[PDB]
Structure formats: structure tokens, C-alpha cells
Amino acid sequence: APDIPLANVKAHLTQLSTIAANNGGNRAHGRPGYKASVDYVKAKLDAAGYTTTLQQFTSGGATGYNLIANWPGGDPNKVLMAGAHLDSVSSGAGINDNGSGSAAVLETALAVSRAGYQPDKHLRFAWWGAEELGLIGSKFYVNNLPSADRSKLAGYLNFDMIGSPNPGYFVYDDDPVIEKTFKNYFAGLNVPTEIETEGDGRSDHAPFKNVGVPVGGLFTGAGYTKSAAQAQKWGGTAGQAFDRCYHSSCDSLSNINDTALDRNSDAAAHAIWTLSS
Ligand SMILES: CC(C)C[C@H](N)C(=O)O
Ligand SMILES: [Ca+2]
Ligand SMILES: [Zn+2]
Ligand SMILES: [Zn+2]
């Protein structure tokens, strides 16, 4: 797998920050900042050769969208999916929650095209809308997939908050194969990892997990406090939240730790290449 360039990931975050600033200060469901985010991501994917689909749904009286991108080729009966929610809360730009996961998945999708990669399994990427209203977009996608198509899903990888400013390195403890793939990557960098407990079933992997699709993912921490033991293994500040700007107006471009964002973006590409062989 390729090394994902941190500068390219940060460039997507800068574009999402500008879109929020030009649209009222946020990228929330039912507000212009969300559709403008979808448009930026879709344009990059269409230029790289992906087949893109906009799935529309209505929640809380407003139209939301999911963006689904399929890389042509691969085994249609074994699909590997990776995704991230693209909406923010209305209090701010949502750069770490979840511009960080959205940008890492977008750059990995662009890396597949730049590399001319032809995977054995078919690759599909998704950006979910309305996750902040209760996983509405990912629930809509799973509820609308016929059972014949659900059985073709080999796994779903989720990236939701992967650039926290005072980070931890947490790996989901769901499917064992996906979990091991991420743990082995971090072992090679000599970065320890811990099992994800803070989020639980509170992100877009839940609807997939509930219907039997193997799931996994990465997380760097939100409102919980980093312990002394955690600061010893990862650096940062003990006694302070992993993300002091969670759901706040200060979740902006300065609310990102570059080392964590780079390591998690690289880990995402490593898992996507490894599991699609
Ligand atoms: C609980 C954490 C993984 C983040 C949560 N899913 C959110 O979007 O706020
Ligand atoms: Ca990198
Ligand atoms: Zn989130
Ligand atoms: Zn959130």
C-alpha cells in the first residue's frame, strides 16, 4: 500500500473549513454547508474515475444525502467498503468530527486511482449524511440494500474522529480479522493501541454490525479524559480531554494533531489494500 501524503489530507480539511466559513459556519444536515461538502468530495472522485451515486433521504423535514463511490472492477460478490460521516453539528465546522475521517477516506480513494490499483475485491467508499441526528444516513443505506446485496459485503471499515488534538490510538474490537490488520500496522510503527470503548455503537458502523457485516475502525478519542498511563504511552497531556473542542465552535483547522491524522490515514490505506487482496 502507498504512504498517504499528510499534505493532501490537510488540503481537503482546508477546503472543508472554507466551505463552512462561506456557509454560516457549519456543515450540518439540512444547511447549505453540508451539500457544498458533498459537492467538493464528489467532484474529486468523478475526476479520478469513480462511478458516484447521490442517495437522497428526508430527516427532520430536510433533505440529506449519502455519497457512494464505486471503483470499477473487482469481484462483484465480495465488496469491501470504507466510510466516514460528512456532516458536522451546527455549532462549528466539524474539522476533527468528522472532516478528519472524511478526508482520510477521500485521499485513500484518490490514492487507489493514482496507483492504478486493481483489487481482487470490489472497492466501495461512502460519505454519510445526518450521522449527528442518530446515524440516519448509514441506517438509510443499510435499510435499503436488498438482502442479495447485503450478503456481498465482505466488511465495512469506519473512520470517525482520527485527528484528535491530544490523541489516543484506539482500534474497534469487532471483527477479529479487521482488528488484527489495524493492530499489526501500528505494531510496525511501534505505537501501542487500546480497544475502543468511548464510542461504543455510536457511529456509522453500527447499522452494518447489526445485520451481520464484519466491521472495524479507528478512533483517537473525544470528550473522555486521557489518563496518566495513556499520556506515558502516547504523549500529550494527562487530565485533559482527547478532544477539548468536541462538538464545539473551536473544532476548526487548529483542532487537529498532524501525527495522529497521518498515522491513521496511512493505517486506513494499509487496511484497504490488505483486505482487498
Ligand atoms: C462517539 C464518537 C465515535 C463520535 C460520534 N459518532 C459523533 O459523531 O459525535
Ligand atoms: Ca503518510
Ligand atoms: Zn463523528
Ligand atoms: Zn459528532
Side-chain angles (χ1 to χ4, degrees), residues 1-199 201 203-277:
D3 171 5
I4 295 299
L6 172 70
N8 289 8
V9 179
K10 301 206 76 183
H12 299 313
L13 296 178
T14 298
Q15 289 296 319
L16 293 173
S17 176
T18 301
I19 285 164
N22 292 167
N23 291 98
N26 65 71
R27 304 179 305 94
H29 173 70
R31 270 94 166 177
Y34 180 73
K35 181 56 162 50
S37 297
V38 169
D39 291 340
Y40 168 74
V41 180
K42 188 179 186 297
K44 295 298 192 222
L45 299 161
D46 284 339
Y50 284 82
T51 291
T52 55
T53 303
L54 277 175
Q55 183 172 59
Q56 182 176 304
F57 56 87
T58 297
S59 193
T63 298
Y65 310 80
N66 290 325
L67 169 63
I68 307 297
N70 280 276
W71 183 235
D75 188 345
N77 305 297
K78 284 183 285 274
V79 179
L80 179 70
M81 282 192 73
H85 74 97
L86 184 62
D87 61 318
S88 64
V89 288
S90 60
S91 69
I95 298 304
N96 187 36
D97 183 20
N98 181 39
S100 64
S102 288
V105 175
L106 172 59
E107 191 58 24
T108 294
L110 297 179
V112 164
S113 178
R114 284 200 301 268
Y117 180 43
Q118 180 171 285
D120 292 323
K121 299 194 175 63
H122 174 73
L123 291 177
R124 177 180 298 148
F125 295 93
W127 286 267
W128 309 117
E131 184 274 344
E132 299 286 7
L133 273 64
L135 320 187
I136 302 304
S138 54
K139 276 178 180 186
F140 185 86
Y141 180 83
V142 179
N143 287 344
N144 282 288
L145 273 188
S147 62
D149 288 342
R150 179 184 328 135
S151 61
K152 288 173 188 151
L153 294 174
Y156 169 69
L157 307 180
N158 194 56
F159 302 91
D160 183 358
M161 294 180 73
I162 56 168
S164 306
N166 176 26
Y169 293 86
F170 300 100
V171 177
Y172 291 18
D173 179 36
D174 291 302
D175 178 83
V177 173
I178 292 171
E179 171 176 16
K180 185 165 193 297
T181 301
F182 284 126
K183 283 174 93 181
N184 287 175
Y185 179 75
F186 283 97
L189 302 182
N190 205 34
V191 170
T193 62
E194 284 186 6
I195 285 181
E196 199 301 308
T197 59
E198 176 169 22
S203 187
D204 298 296
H205 60 306
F208 288 92
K209 181 175 175 175
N210 284 342
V211 301
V213 181
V215 303
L218 297 174
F219 173 59
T220 50
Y224 279 16
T225 305
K226 175 179 276 179
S227 72
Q230 291 169 326
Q232 170 64 66
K233 58 178 131 175
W234 299 311
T237 314
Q240 295 289 303
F242 289 100
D243 183 345
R244 282 174 281 195
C245 289
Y246 177 56
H247 286 183
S248 307
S249 63
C250 57
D251 184 10
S252 66
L253 286 179
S254 58
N255 199 45
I256 287 292
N257 179 278
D258 285 355
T259 299
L261 183 65
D262 184 29
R263 285 168 176 173
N264 286 304
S265 297
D266 291 345
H270 174 83
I272 285 172
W273 254 256
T274 296
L275 296 164
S276 61
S277 306

